[PDB]
């Protein structure tokens, strides 16, 4: 079995870089706290007991309210009068830093105005090793460079609006199957623990960890550790990933929270680098916690050093201050658990005051315009044989497919969006929000047509192929809408247990396209989907005159696609993943079977860095549509590639020592931390207090009281100055990684008759034997008027040209010659240059 | 068994009234025709053989093209790039002469531009004796006066746009069950003929015939005779209804066509007053006809007098000339049978040229605006507890019910509209058109809300009561859409064989309302339906703050209802029928069982004139919402009723004689009418020519050749001058009926704060025993600004105050005292006056 070696102690915060002032303030206030006040910040109060999906204990003596933590990465979950933004995969499709930032800002505004302190997003894990992975859509792209940039901008936008962002899921949660033992049980498997993702150190650094470095460098306040194991150590107690990679190497100064029921042990997790238990209980509404009283006891009995729990509270408070939450705080003004105006303060048990739990605060502002715009700008034009844009003089339009129409249960009619009924604007699970409304394609396009003389019919039963054919036969243009859905592992839709069982269109989609294309010579296909689908059977049909991929656009879906189809927006999105001929062209099969007996199933990441386009390139598979590809209503030309070497400082591997750990504040006698007698204990609520000064009894852990060496690795309680890792030194790693080595410029010209955007892309060949032919490094979306030329300049950093050396435990720019390729897809790379050796 | 007495001969045209010039011209051209040319005009060419649902033969020698006849009363059937207008029942709900006319004009323009010569509409039969009758919605109202006025205006509009209108279905086709023997067979009944409607002479005159008098007086070109029997004599060979009532009494100068396969015999129909056989064959694609060669033979063998077939051609050509079709003619530029560009000229057999059969001509003009308007103006506000109009600042709107949503097969996805899927904008059968598009309530209201900050959810599964409740709970206002559907007898939807099996909301509708009202304190209910529904289970729920009936609004449905709900239009429609507590409150049960053994089922019209509100009034049944009732966003008051007796000419019962019948043109030897040698005969096509000069063989009728007295009533071939009937004398009867006897005026005032329309109504009590307490006679829709007053002046004619006297066979103003009642519904009649004797 794969083994995750120990890395201890859990590094303590030090106010490095831009965290200096908030670290000082965090220390100042945590120094004033009692042990139980500190424990309160670290532990949620239990599932469904307050307003938000996660809520910490409060520190009322110091005027610190409970931190409210709320899903999702695309909008506020379980609320009202809020917006539903396009999914993260759409943002990836924009290839646009500014739209990622703006979306982050707009989301942060809405979260803030509902009284939410922590947004549980954005996501770069799963990255997207498996195209059928159920949650890839919540993130960005399988490409680490593209994902990292847009992850970071999203984080900056959320945090500039005064809400803590949470980089999730850290790390290697690349599939839903077996992510949780009780879920697997409920699906009829018998396994003793969650799936283990087994991955080598090079691949970890060069692929899966890379976007998390970006998040740390961008100043992200929190990281959410994952449900799965890595090398058979749970995400929320993996000392290698949390202590060594995230904290020691990347220099992360904020706090690690668990995914919901991803916390498995009190002492183990705390020493392995967890900082916050959510939603606080052992299991939902168990009325027990791995922390709470257990964390109080674990400190009181001398096992968990005071400096470790102090560090947790310093990290949490530093983040809270870093986004200015102390100045922006407002109390939650909604409830996650009901839409009623009135209800019990503690919903799961019907206790506390019966009070106004929803104030119905309109937080939407004008964010609808931004959502519409991102929807248009994330629409990838894959094929256009002079079909588009439409004129609005078409004699008859046919709108075809269930994906054009309405969810007859309402936009929010399926809990957690757990269905594929009507237009697919949002995929399923906890990465969801309630729609304030949903504009369907049927609605938007009919409205467009009815401004002129056009006739229009909408056939939204995908199983009525006779009716689809008949409408298609009469039409000047047939607009076919189709979809493929997936989601979080706890929710099964038509037997798809989060992960999608195939990558074929749902709801008879291939047959809708074929029936339409057989009856209409001008058939345009629009795909709403969580990721790539198989299009081999119909994409080159001579009647399929248009193909677009529109992802999961949120509330303005219809309007976003109409804008593109009628030419108000000239599409300029590029594919953020590869469109292959078969499922098998992708490699990386999901682990769908209990492949380790009754033990934890094992998923070995033997593909290494060769996922998505890197796999296709290595195995010489030809994509139908490649990573980075998309069309436009104009044409562009790239020319005049130049490389400017920059006078850069040398890389200095980091050396020396940290400071020794510090205790902040004092801990007294066990008696100080017993429950106050007049406090009415709410049932199932998780408090920091102990029942009595009997510590064994107050914990109730039937294995309580062993000597440390029986169950705690060496060094886990060592508070001395520790060595600095060579690849450490700053936020996101050694600052020498982010030294600029080269400026690379290229001319981009709009050679056609319509204004539009191009996405020029810079790929590098790092050189040497089992390195990918190309990996993406830089890109930009540039708007050009007809005939306009602009020179695009980007930079290559040391890190962009480096490889992870497992022996040095450092990033190294290898002696192999490096070559750059510039173009407008991962396969349309007409320009190139050999780079000189960099300093 | 009820018996229909003989009335013969079939009266011949005489260019009466406004028909004088076109009669002259018709005679002139028919005089030039050979027998087979004449027969060609009288007989369709067979089902699915040419472009239109009906097409006559042509007269190419005289440059007369084939007459193209097309459904429906609400828009062109089986075509493209056309409009779908609101149904006739919506027109009735407007109570607006002008909207009826304008809709007629708009329809006529579209029919004309497709190359259609005859619109198969409008309808006043079924009138609406049975609230569950499947086709009442195609017509106007069970009230004859309201129906007659709006029937007539519709006819005038169609004909002023240059298309022949067809007054249908004549007469007593009050239900779909058993209307046709083969339909009944297909539904598992064994009956030897169609249902017979048995109805007394008084009731016929005072109720069912009345709107047809209006049609005739309005100059209607054609009448379609019905599938049913009247007193056990088929509609298309009933000598009493066609010869005596329509032709002799009402003076009808145009032509009678059969409903499609309603023609039952060659000689019998011709002498009983039929003028045109549609679609021309005995049964669909039989390749035989009751006329065609049989009519040629029936003349050649001396049975059917020449004057009878000449008269048929005169009546047909006179109608064609009356609307100016000779100047407006354009060839049909579409096909009923396919939407493909190219196809065979003769669709059913794939013969003739393979040619362009659809030219896709856009005939819609700007008619969409008129459709949206009529939709708004036909929406009856039944209840409003300060819910309406909406502001567009409502925080969250819930749209609830399948009737709010889309037909997922497309607007035209069910053949002949034979389903109740998504919003109900058009009911089913032949009275249908293809939508150019359909705006759903979901679409229009979401669009409205999205102009502001309102959140909005649409739950359009009427079975997902949990989802309905949840959305309703969150809403500031819940807009519940519900429906009830019906249609023509040939098509069964969910076991409803045209006629609806009950008058309860379809698709779980009562439950949708209740679920919504239990969860939302501001629930507005919008009903789209063919006619009245039962609302007793929720109408007075304290959370039902609004109730509207929007009928069948056609293509702009969503926009029409949004206009009303958001107050761009202040609703002023009144109910054109009664909303009762139970089905039983209406009386008039349908005949749903083979009630006469294996014979023709019998339906006796024992209720007489007492249908709809007249029944309620007689049996002291209290309607939930009465005939003529509707609310508005303002209030009105009526006052100062005055009655002025007028200096009227006396009624003179008509006397004297007609002219004797005339032959127009000559008939030669049988050999002149044999098929021409070189003519390629299209299979199944109905031609006027005979196979040979052997007449018996050319007919092939296995009972051919009896002496007349064995199977033809006395007088049926009598061409002598005939007596004029006392109640005859002009178009729609004796012109003394239309003399004004009283001028009646009343003041109407808008006493509220919004501009709006009121519909003042004048009812009369004709007096005597077994007469209704009140019957509607006059009405008008009047627009008033807040505080504005206007005086409405109308008249009462002799006919308005008369009764049909079975002994005199005449209309008589009886000596019983008459009283008038003025108000704004059939029960809100605060003003009254006894009339002096005229
Ligand atoms: C103060 O106070 C406090 C509070 O109050 C307290 O505390 C307490 O304490 C106690 C003691 O005393 C405890 O208990 C314990 O615990 C433990 C732990 O757990 C956790 O973790 C795990 C893992 O581990 C690992 O890791 C970590 C981190 O993460 C660390 O820490 C450790 O040390 C380790 O390490 C290792 O490895 C790594 C990698 O991975 C590396 O790196 C290093 O170096 C090393 O090597 C896990 O597993 C767990 O989990 C589980 O559980 C949970 C709950 O908690 C859940 O949730 C999950 O799911 C899971 O489950 C599963 O499994 C189980 C079992 O366990 C079952 O049952 C189920 O069913 C399933 O399947 C966690 O998380 C532990 O371990 C322990 O236990 C043990 O013992 C018992 C008794 O007998 C049994 O039963 C079990 O089984 C076990 O066993 C084991 O061991 C033994 C000895 O010890 C042996 O014999 C056996 O064989 C086994 O072994 C195996 O395994 C191991 C591990 O892995 C290895 O090592 C080996 O090799 C083999 O393979 C107990 O339980 C508790 O916890 C606490 N509490 C709290 C609340 O905190 C104290 O005490 C006080 N003090 C005074 C003085 O007073
Ligand atoms: C020239 O040419 C031409 C052409 O080509 C020709 O013609 C022809 O002719 C033939 C003869 O010959 C014919 O046939 C015949 O016909 C008849 C008629 O039919 C129809 O109608 C009916 C009714 O009737 C009624 O009405 C009318 C009017 O509307 C009239 O016209 C008549 O006359 C009558 O009358 C009566 O009544 C009324 C009331 O209603 C009154 O008003 C009066 O006064 C009187 O009384 C009907 O019914 C029919 O119908 C049926 O048919 C159809 C087909 O067509 C169908 O669609 C329907 O549905 C029905 O059916 C049912 O029925 C049947 C039976 O009929 C069966 O089969 C089935 O299944 C079902 O159920 C029509 O519309 C007829 O009638 C005839 O028949 C007869 O006879 C046979 C043999 O014998 C038998 O079978 C039958 O049954 C019958 O019988 C009867 O009658 C007889 C005498 O006539 C007697 O004897 C017996 O007994 C019986 O009786 C009974 O019944 C009746 C009835 O109603 C009564 O009346 C009694 O009383 C009793 O009860 C035959 O068929 C044909 O049509 C023709 N064709 C064409 C194309 O046009 C000619 O011929 C030529 N000419 C030369 C010289 O050559
Ligand atoms: C990849 O992964 C996806 C997702 O898991 C897999 O998709 C799933 O594939 C299975 C297997 O094919 C599907 O189950 C099938 O669903 C069929 C359709 O079910 C729906 O429609 C039924 C019938 O609906 C028609 O008829 C009714 C009444 O007769 C009408 O109301 C309705 O409007 C329809 O009318 C049409 O058809 C009738 C004739 O039947 C005509 O007369 C009409 O004119 C008109 O043309 C209905 O009963 C049912 O309740 C459904 O609503 C079903 O027939 C078949 O037996 C089977 O159950 C899943 O639905 C599908 N799920 C998803 C999410 O797509 C996919 O298979 C997989 N691919 C591969 C290659 O592994
Ligand atoms: C302190 O943390 C410990 C865990 O380290 C908590 O003890 C654990 O509490 C859970 C209840 O949430 C126990 O689960 C129960 O186990 C029985 C055993 O068969 C099972 O039948 C129940 O369905 C349930 O799974 C678990 O056994 C227990 N673990 C041990 C080793 O004692 C404890 O509750 C925490 N204390 C506080 C104050 O929250
Ligand atoms: Cl919710
Ligand atoms: Cl059609
Ligand atoms: Mg191929
Ligand atoms: Mg226990």
Numbering used by the authors:
A (entry chain A): 23 to 861
B (entry chain B): 23 to 860
Share the article's original sentences.
β-d-Glucosidases (EC 3.2.1.21) are classical glycoside hydrolases that catalyse the hydrolysis of the nonreducing terminal glucose from β-linked d-gluco-oligosaccharides and aryl-β-d-glucosides. Here, the three-dimensional structures of two industrially important family GH3 β-d-glucosidases from Aspergillus fumigatus and A. oryzae, solved by molecular replacement and refined at 1.95 Å resolution, are reported. Both enzymes, which share 78% sequence identity, display a three-domain structure with the catalytic domain at the interface, as originally shown for barley β-d-glucan exohydrolase, the first three-dimensional structure solved from glycoside hydrolase family GH3.
In AoβG the four protomers in the asymmetric unit are arranged as two dimers, with the second (chains C and D) at right angles to the first (chains A and B), interacting via their FnIII domains (chain A with C and chain B with D). There are no sugar-mediated interactions in the FnIII dimer–dimer interfaces, which are comprised solely of protein–protein and protein–solvent hydrogen bonds, whilst there are a couple of interactions between glycans at the subunit–subunit interface between chains A and B and chains C and D within each dimer, as detailed below. In AoβG there is a PEG molecule bound in the +1 site, hydrogen-bonded to Asp93 OD2 (in three of the four molecules) and/or to Arg99 NH1 (in two of the four protomers in the asymmetric unit). Substrate-specificity studies with AoβG have demonstrated a tight specificity for β-d-glucopyranoside in the −1 subsite, with a much broader tolerance at the +1 subsite with similar catalytic efficiencies for glucose-β-1,2-, β-1,3-, β-1,4- and β-1,6-linked glucose and p-nitrophenyl-β-d-glucopyranoside. There are 13 potential N-glycosylation sites in the amino-acid sequences of each of AfβG and AoβG, with nine and ten of them being occupied in their respective crystal structures; we have modelled 45 and 46 sugars in chains A and B, respectively, for AfβG, whilst AoβG has 40, 42, 41 and 34 sugars modelled in chains A, B, C and D, respectively. The largest N-glycan is linked to Asn323 in domain A, where it is visible as a complete nine-mannose tree in AfβG and AoβG (chains A and B in the latter, chains C and D having seven and six mannoses, respectively). Intriguingly, those sites located on the protein surface (Asn543 and Asn715 in AfβG, Asn212 and Asn543 in AoβG) appear to have been truncated to a single GlcNAc molecule linked to their corresponding Asn residue, despite no attempt having been made to remove external N-glycans enzymatically. In addition, the external site at Asn713 in AoβG (equivalent to Asn715 in AfβG) remained uncleaved even though the first GlcNAc molecule is in a very similar position and orientation to its equivalents in the other two structures.
